[PDB]
């Protein structure tokens, strides 16, 4: 009986939540909706932390085999080395959006009754070096992220290598596994729409909580990030964007006049994905060369969200502040790496990026499987669609710059 | 040099075990037997354990993919209710057949020194969501059959999705996954004959030994397991399928006269899958349509033993009583549930479901990592040939008779 | 990256290279700098096949065990494969027996946790048997296990195979598109091995740079004397095992070399069993064997087959054992005959295969690599493993050329 504009679906349960969920913060003894509703969403958390697994892994093996080179010629060179810098530089100025808000801090929580302890983090040489998995099976196995990681963009960068192979039976082979693993991609964000179904339920007991437990004071620290994220987003519209259009050709302002229709349907869907019959389109309608738009527009469908790298960027900021961590520099410049990675895998369907935010959480220091981390997660998750949108929205919008100013180069 | 009738050859280490056994455990000191030939057995149970983890998953994300909606026409849904109903009713009828016998009970065992303990079976909403794996490769890696199963179905279900998908890359992968996943299974029962094969001497040394250390007392215990089955078992079809017959339109004491060659067949092989042709031959004798006999049969073939979901209910029984454990109500109804899934995957070899008893078992509270846990389930696995005759032979009927029903549908 | 040379020479240049920036910081120096910093470059090496080891058993026994699998096999190549595994098998006693003459390694005893290398107390002949059927598979793989992982690749790749013969279409096509899956694992995962042989300079550079550093001048006659012991075996094998054989059936063994040169050569300087192949069975034409007999076998010789890896294998195990103070025992003597038949039966024959291989091997006899002591000991025969790597690649290549020979004399 439950079918419904999907993401007005959710900003229902989401302002409902936070009304049922104030109010029994009041009236009502919280260890009431502590004890009944609480599960709910809880049932939503733990069914994305299942993809979080197989969704880095069979993710970056397929992502990896996207890039890599020899596998892409130099109309594509020249398009990946934007998308890894400009993708960059959207993380750097998520970092730093999120540097100039607070966003979270004073959100102050100790779920097990004890503040989020930092386990000590080891000599460099160790901590480098300790990422080579031993065993990747183990890996993958038992949590590992990053291992992981670089197991998969190492065989991920092999798969392609086989493909250039003089040998058939070698070929065959490598193919079909990378067909395998891709479709364990696939079949997973086919079950990231599973959970994002349940998703009204989720997030409304998500943030009914967040309201019930949290008192007031949570609202505006829950609005201080969707600010810290949309301000950074338009910021990276104006400072990045229009910024290297001006610097080759393409007159900027008048970019956005045809570029309309696919930002606002990239916006509402939520998902990079469903916008590509509308931003090929678009693309068309710019000068831009069929073979030039056919290459690049849905390569960067999935490798190249400057939205998510922004958002992962902005939301590893919110969690340390959360428990009450001072997030470091080079943990700072990991957050730029990793969320670099982080985007470059991130699915661009719906929901995408909050699934894999994990593993740049993961790799700074707050593993999920952390009483304390995965609470400051869990309140964070209940905001996603609203920031799903204007993240979604870039991630389409940064195929198109460099689309026109690789076009220019032509 | 070893290759006879590969049923008699079990039945003739079986009686010929029961007695190099009993006697031993008079005139000689069955620590003698426990030394020398109980490895040998052992050999055995161990082989089969190996694969009940990938042949749960493996054969959960294949037969998952046989019944997901929608993957299945309307002739195959008005199958399927009738599949999930039939098989279903046979474990209630299963678990109700071993309520009235005590089997097991009495055969009192604690071999760690000390009887089975049951680890306390913790506040529903942790049970319930403690099964949505937190990260799907460490619960197949290692051990955790209920969230590996959830996975499958969870995967499986998916896996149909993306051949309905619009795109071509991403509906050959997910089959060439799909593939693989199969072939998996499929390798995987291929090993089950294998050990099938060594089964002899392993069910030699088997009761060589439940009639060496359990004195003569076992014996019975052992045939009041088969009585509790084969009389569930055409209790199930008298009081199942004539009941049923009888309320659409085909003659019910008829239908056993056509459908004699199918049955015997599928008595003596031991293996739903043989008795296919044969089956489909006799399908053919009853007015039945080619459409109609073509879709239900051979699925049939795999889903849809009403015969193991009565074994897995009466086994599982046979198991608490064994150890001294009072099998409850909720863990009751689960065995229904599980035993429907157990046997939903059971593949319909040899002794398939022999080994899919361990996925109902792991379920209910009975881990086979559990020293007197596979214990009692070692001395069961010793008669499986018996029931696997009435058990086989059931789930053949039980596609006959949907056929039929849903052929008056028609 | 500016790195692309002659990449064996390659090598031998960052080789004899280590041994002297570390043997002279091993005086003047503190080799608590060479500890500190150049170390950790030979551990990323280490690492990095490590990292291999445990997909690259798995994928290539059930691709290997899949390869002669009956019946998948015709007679023509059941007469061959009877011929490998007795040479193969051979080979290693041969070795062992080498490396019992030479004691290599002994006298380079090390304890690096402070504490000499405990043997953890090897368990009642029913369990350590028993013990090898995994209870879940996956659980093997994941967590280390090499033995059952082995058990079960060649329990599964015979399956495989059956399933190919079998008399439905769906159930093939699944078998397949599987056995295809896995293979392709199994080469993606080599061609990792080609990555991090391209690293390997700096590797092996850092690794006796420090055999050098820290283990004195005593080490270096050590390294040697294994070499030793290897290619004293390996061309004991040539003599007094193909042209054992050779004279035994109709082939003028002298003259066989005479036609077989450039192919042996070829296999020195590739150091890939597999790169001497176009030009193994260009000789192999050029000595009258016939186009269907040197179709089947020199290309199958290729992988399964490398009598210079397992006699490898054999003297590596006793350089571990010998190296941390073990006494390697009778049993787990003919354990390394049996486990380096296997081990070199899944021997890539690539560059580095057999280093990686050897884990399996080491690893069955008791010393695992996850034990300080051990994978120091294997970071040190590491080091002057292209050197083997030439002589071990070279055999391999030969017994192909000689088995060939053999059934073609049958036939
Ligand atoms: N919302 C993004 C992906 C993400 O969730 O990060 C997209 O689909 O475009
Ligand atoms: N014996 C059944 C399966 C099982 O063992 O439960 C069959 O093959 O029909
Ligand atoms: N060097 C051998 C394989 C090995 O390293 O053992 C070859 O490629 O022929
Ligand atoms: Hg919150
Ligand atoms: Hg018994
Ligand atoms: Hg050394
Ligand atoms: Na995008
Ligand atoms: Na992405
Ligand atoms: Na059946
Ligand atoms: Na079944
Ligand atoms: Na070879
Ligand atoms: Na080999």
């Given at each position: 009986?439950?079918?419904?504009?999907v993401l007005q679906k959710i900003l229902?349960?989401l302002?409902?939540?936070?009304?049922?969920?104030?109010?029994?913060?009041?009236?009502?003894?919280?260890?009431?909706?502590?004890?009944?509703?609480?599960?709910?969403?809880?049932?939503?958390?733990?069914?994305?932390?299942?993809?979080?697994?197989?969704?880095?892994?069979?993710?970056?093996?397929?992502?990896?085999?996207?890039?890599?080179?020899?596998?892409?010629?130099?109309?594509?060179?020249?398009?990946?080395?934007?998308?890894?810098?400009?993708?960059?530089?959207?993380?750097?100025?998520?970092?730093?959006?999120?540097?100039?808000?607070?966003?979270?801090?004073?959100?102050?929580?100790?779920?097990?009754?004890?503040?989020?302890?930092?386990?000590?983090?080891?000599?460099?040489?160790?901590?480098?070096?300790?990422?080579?998995?031993?065993?990747?099976?183990?890996?993958?196995?038992?949590?590992?992220?990053?291992?992981?990681?670089?197991?998969?963009?190492?065989?991920?960068?092999?798969?392609?290598?086989?493909?250039?192979?003089?040998?058939?039976?070698?070929?065959?082979?490598?193919?079909?596994?990378?067909?395998?693993?891709?479709?364990?991609?696939?079949?997973?964000?086919?079950?990231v729409n599973?959970?994002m179904?349940?998703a009204?339920?989720?997030v409304?007991?998500?943030?009914?909580?967040?309201?019930?437990?949290?008192?007031?004071?949570?609202?505006?620290?829950?609005?201080?990030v969707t600010?810290?994220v949309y301000?950074?987003l338009?910021?990276?519209?104006?400072?990045?964007?229009?910024?290297?259009?001006?610097?080759?050709?393409?007159?900027?302002?008048?970019?956005?006049?045809?570029?309309?229709?696919?930002?606002?349907?990239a916006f509402v869907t939520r998902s990079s994905s469903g916008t590509?019959?509308?931003?090929?389109?678009?693309?068309?309608?710019?000068?831009?060369?069929?073979?030039?738009?056919?290459?690049?527009?849905?390569?960067?469908?999935?490798?190249?969200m400057?939205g998510t790298?922004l958002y992962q960027?902005?939301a590893?900021?919110?969690?340390?502040?959360?428990?009450?961590?001072?997030?470091?520099?080079?943990?700072?410049?990991?957050?730029?790496?990793?969320?670099?990675?982080?985007?470059?895998?991130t699915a661009g369907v719906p929901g995408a990026g909050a699934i894999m935010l994990?593993?740049?959480?993961?790799?700074?220091?707050?593993?999920?499987?952390?009483?304390?981390?995965?609470?400051?997660?869990?309140?964070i998750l209940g905001i996603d669609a609203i920031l799903d949108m204007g993240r979604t929205m870039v991630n389409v919008?940064?195929?198109?710059?460099?689309?026109?100013?690789?076009?220019?180069?032509?």
């Amino acid at each position: 009986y439950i079918e419904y504009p999907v993401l007005q679906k959710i900003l229902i349960g989401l302002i409902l939540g936070a009304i049922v969920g104030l109010i029994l913060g009041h009236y009502g003894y919280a260890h009431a909706v502590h004890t009944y509703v609480k599960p709910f969403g809880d049932l939503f958390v733990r069914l994305l932390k299942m993809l979080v697994m197989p969704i880095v892994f069979a993710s970056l093996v397929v992502g990896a085999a996207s890039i890599s080179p020899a596998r892409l010629g130099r109309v594509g060179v020249k398009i990946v080395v934007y998308y890894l810098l400009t993708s960059a530089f959207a993380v750097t100025l998520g970092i730093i959006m999120a540097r100039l808000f607070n966003p979270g801090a004073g959100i102050h929580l100790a779920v097990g009754g004890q503040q989020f302890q930092p386990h000590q983090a080891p000599p460099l040489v160790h901590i480098l070096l300790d990422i080579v998995p031993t065993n990747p099976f183990g890996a993958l196995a038992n949590g590992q992220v990053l291992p992981t990681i670089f197991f998969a963009i190492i065989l991920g960068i092999a798969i392609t290598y086989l493909m250039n192979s003089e040998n058939e039976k070698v070929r065959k082979s490598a193919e079909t596994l990378l067909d395998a693993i891709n479709g364990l991609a696939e079949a997973m964000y086919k079950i990231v729409n599973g959970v994002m179904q349940y998703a009204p339920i989720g997030v409304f007991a998500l943030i009914a909580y967040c309201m019930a437990e949290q008192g007031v004071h949570v609202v505006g620290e829950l609005a201080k990030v969707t600010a810290a994220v949309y301000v950074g987003l338009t910021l990276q519209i104006l400072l990045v964007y229009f910024v290297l259009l001006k610097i080759y050709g393409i007159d900027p302002i008048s970019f956005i006049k045809h570029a309309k229709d696919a930002m606002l349907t990239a916006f509402v869907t939520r998902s990079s994905s469903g916008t590509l019959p509308v931003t090929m389109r678009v693309a068309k309608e710019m000068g831009i060369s069929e073979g030039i738009y056919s290459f690049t527009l849905p390569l960067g469908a999935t490798i190249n969200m400057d939205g998510t790298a922004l958002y992962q960027g902005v939301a590893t900021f919110f969690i340390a502040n959360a428990l009450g961590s001072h997030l470091t520099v080079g943990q700072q410049l990991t957050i730029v790496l990793t969320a670099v990675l982080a985007s470059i895998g991130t699915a661009g369907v719906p929901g995408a990026g909050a699934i894999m935010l994990a593993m740049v959480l993961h790799s700074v220091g707050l593993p999920l499987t952390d009483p304390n981390v995965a609470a400051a997660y869990a309140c964070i998750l209940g905001i996603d669609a609203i920031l799903d949108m204007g993240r979604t929205m870039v991630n389409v919008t940064g195929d198109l710059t460099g689309t026109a100013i690789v076009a220019k180069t032509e």
